[PDB]
Design a protein around this ligand. Structure first.
Ligand SMILES: [Ca+2]
Ligand SMILES: [Ca+2]
Ligand SMILES: [Ca+2]
Ligand SMILES: [Ca+2]
Ligand SMILES: [Ca+2]
Ligand SMILES: [Ca+2]
Ligand SMILES: [Ca+2]
Ligand SMILES: [Ca+2]
Ligand SMILES: [Ca+2]
Ligand SMILES: [Ca+2]
Ligand SMILES: [Ca+2]
Ligand SMILES: [Ca+2]
Ligand SMILES: [Cl-]
Ligand SMILES: [Cl-]
Ligand SMILES: [Cl-]
Ligand SMILES: [Cl-]
Ligand SMILES: [Cl-]
Ligand SMILES: [Cl-]
Ligand SMILES: [Cl-]
Ligand SMILES: [Cl-]
Lengths: 163, 162, 163, 163, 162, 174, 174, 163
């Protein structure tokens, strides 16, 4: 029915934007160009649970800085980053695995996520997403990016105990 | 996909009342008389949208004592005390010669979802029930009662409403 | 399970404080002392869903408050107001309904609710409750009094669909 | 100096919008269409101080609004309401007072104030004003409409002591 | 120095009205009839303080149409429509046999400063004028109209008001 | 007295969870995977005040991340971390210290704290705790984790001056 | 049209202040005096979108702190910083680029931006700007510095999709 | 008069607490014990102006970590830190210079500032100060610690332009 949240039976894969989706879009920088971002332990918990349930996972980012890959390492899920066209990378990634895009949940926050949203069955915007992104999503989290939005999504799929 | 509605996309604006033009609160006295708060910014936006030639309607399930008074002030028709808003909307569209695809409908709660399904441009206020926020084609940044309709008016008519 | 939210299986009755619980604790007054309060349509929906589900309902208020009686009539649930002691009135009411207090959910916000909290199995504080009351509760809403706290509780019992 | 706040030396008149400027833009309504609005005691104090200081005062509102006239009486300042065009009424009012529009401070919040802003030397937006209005102003309050924005402006003119 | 007032420090609690027990807003109708919002938590706190035996008073400069009605509900005396609150307070202290040093006075604005000077325990609400916040001996964390008196009651009587 | 806040007479020990309790549950990470967390100076002052009052202190954590020990070092309080089962570690520690679990205050924020909550007399949830944890607690702070929740608890136990000053406002030695 | 927001037709250049405009005006400092600042990825996307649209870009700053250049490097836009007089540097730069100051958008937050504001056609204050700066501006963002104020400005100029997608929602190449 | 803010003629010295007064009381830490804090550029501006006006300045802290001294170096003002008793250090500091404590402005936020407050003529609390500290101050800033509270204080002493 219209507006229904995704369930475990609806999806085979979870693809996550990084900055602004797993973070609050802020980046700490030094004079050398080193970057730091804040991630949320609740998201860690949610991602670990989704991973353990057998879902195919990906972090997808246009950002070249290795900080995204450092987070991906901690979470033990694949990362594709420094990609010019997010949507083309996503299309190719689905086709390499024979995954139906209709059974992909993709989480984003800004306008460079919109072409990905159009490709997949379950586009999800974090609460802090920009206007047109919030609208284009099939579901919207109540928790903002960097505050545990991915844990909230994990609870939709796996239930409140994250079983 | 990443597009707010524009004046070229729509011929009608249909508005829920409680929780969309209000914050979903009702002030009550000892007799059970009811009062609600509306927003003057919404009034300004509604007047600009009406002046631009858009066909407008307020649609509500409440025997709302006050919605007819508000409609009268805004100089737009009202249909209220209806258990099937979607059928009322469909009937109104037919009577007005307006295609549902060209209707912007603004709501906040689960009883708006059947209306959302019928129209081209379902819009949720920021304070909408979680499922309604997702179901909408666009979502306002300001909540019901705080000028959500005023914000929609600027999407359609520009920041100066001109 | 420690901290578990109540479900339909756990409760036979829902008893509600009024000011601060179904309202933000404010009262509009005129020169003659006439009182007006703000209630929430979402609470109205949640209360109707709980009533429709067959739960025995009650509003309890210490002072004779004609505004509470007006609200109760609208909600189609009984009210006991103008009573010496909320907790004793509640105890008598349970004994008469044949209802185990262990299966009563009572919602409150301030220290005058503590004797009721001690009597029932499922004391619930609204988010805006005072410190000691938040602690004394078995569950605490995320939504404050007058903002839809009762609708939240209704969602615990009946699901986010309210059925 | 670019961006300087107005002082007593700069202005001969203070003209005030009502809804959204002296209020939070909300209107309480009943079934008969009777209207009620909330005004701020701090604004009352600020307005009395400006009036006492000898400044020529006026409230301007497009619609015939009996509530605005009640407020104006309390404040002991005149009101022009039920007028075709705010800006033309203002222009005529200035011409009659003998006051240079360059030395008029006008406070507003929405796009219907822009013609007035264009006419006067000191257009002032309340903090809660809409984007284009905040920009169009010569000064912007930090306090929103209905929260004491007029008292803030009175403090610019007379000091935080209001004298 | 770093001490909130306790029951042993005071014999009286004197309360300003607008902006202290209210958010300083007034609702008006077309006739100029005035309505204000008070707080039930404040009511509970005031009742506990009164029950503990503290001598209490509301003091206001407003011909406030509604302050006498509120005082009547709270079962405490009121003095209002007074241009010199400080002299009213001094007179009341003399009549009550209460030493000003043992009075907790709660206010929010510059017209409270002369009262602040007379008493041992001047308290500003969080939303007080900037100078009044500094002038006070203690400052509440909650603003006027939001339960500032309820918060003071817990300083004097403990979190459970017992 | 239902809902009463803990006082100095009620407790002999204060045991603290770390992430989400002394922090906002976020981690700052750099290009190379180094982790940083934000703690609060108010918490630090509260913890030192509790320690000076003679309460037995402890930070308890599940994870290997050495940042917790670094915080514990600065605070001069012991750590029990990298632990398989948190609650068992706590039960054993209580036994070994000769402290009755009924007189232990434990502060936490997440569902993995619930077994510790069940063990102790005074479970306390930070304002930002998971919904079920706020309910399960005997007391709930108003201030969230990383924002001075432990400083708030310290004021429940020691009063508004953290026992640094007496009534008349003079410096407390001891 | 009084108060109108800038559009693509109004401007040929976008010049940005740094601290307080692309940041929240705070600096993170460590035990050894190293300085860090927080910038915003939304601003980064907005800036790149403006640059791709053919607007001449520039970051202008008074201070020697090299962090600004590091940001400018990542954004692929020139820096003019460590400058004695900001406004003179800007007037000269406009002249040298063949850009009329009336078609320059300058974003700032503090009183030292007022002379630049006077120079240009489209001075813009971030929401968090000093009170006099908010007044002096021709437009004021709703979002504060460091929170995506430049991303907001980018949406004024390019629309809600930042010109990455057309009406019908297809990818814009050019 | 009661509650009056300090002026330039009232004071000869400004002594500043660090954590929570020039910061928001947060500290970023690594596994090695390195600390980072966030300071505000507005405070930098205000402190530079107070320094240039000829006031004797000090940053005073019980914190042993060198981060406080790094900030003091950037601001070019003396620091005394790692001090056991803040109040005793302050008393000694005043006496070494023959400064009257009545003409000292001291800014703080927490209970370890109270004995310093009692020593000086002009104790000032930042807006975010703890309850008893806000009360004990002679003046309270409107801006919280780490948000430009010292700039606000500088404006009291030197005027809005910080001349
Ligand atoms: Ca992103
Ligand atoms: Ca509705
Ligand atoms: Ca949608
Ligand atoms: Ca209540
Ligand atoms: Ca509990
Ligand atoms: Ca207006
Ligand atoms: Ca301007
Ligand atoms: Ca008052
Ligand atoms: Ca004081
Ligand atoms: Ca934790
Ligand atoms: Ca700057
Ligand atoms: Ca400090
Ligand atoms: Cl994690
Ligand atoms: Cl209206
Ligand atoms: Cl209802
Ligand atoms: Cl008034
Ligand atoms: Cl009451
Ligand atoms: Cl610390
Ligand atoms: Cl970026
Ligand atoms: Cl600085």
């Amino acid at each position: 029915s219209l507006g229904a949240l995704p369930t475990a039976e609806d999806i085979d894969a979870v693809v996550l934007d990084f900055d602004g989706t797993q973070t609050d879009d802020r980046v700490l920088i030094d004079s050398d160009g080193r970057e730091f971002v804040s991630v949320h332990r609740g998201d860690g918990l949610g991602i670990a649970a989704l991973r353990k349930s057998g879902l195919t996972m990906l972090i997808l980012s246009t950002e070249q800085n290795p900080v995204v890959a450092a987070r991906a390492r901690k979470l033990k899920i694949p990362v594709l980053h420094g990609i010019d066209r997010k949507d083309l990378a996503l299309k190719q990634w689905c086709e390499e695995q024979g995954i139906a895009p209709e059974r992909v949940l993709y989480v984003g926050n800004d306008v460079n996520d919109l072409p990905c949203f159009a490709l997949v069955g379950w586009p999800v915007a974090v609460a802090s997403a920009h206007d047109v992104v919030r609208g284009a999503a099939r579901a919207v989290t109540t928790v903002p990016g960097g505050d545990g939005a991915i844990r909230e999504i994990a609870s939709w799929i796996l239930g409140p105990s994250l079983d």
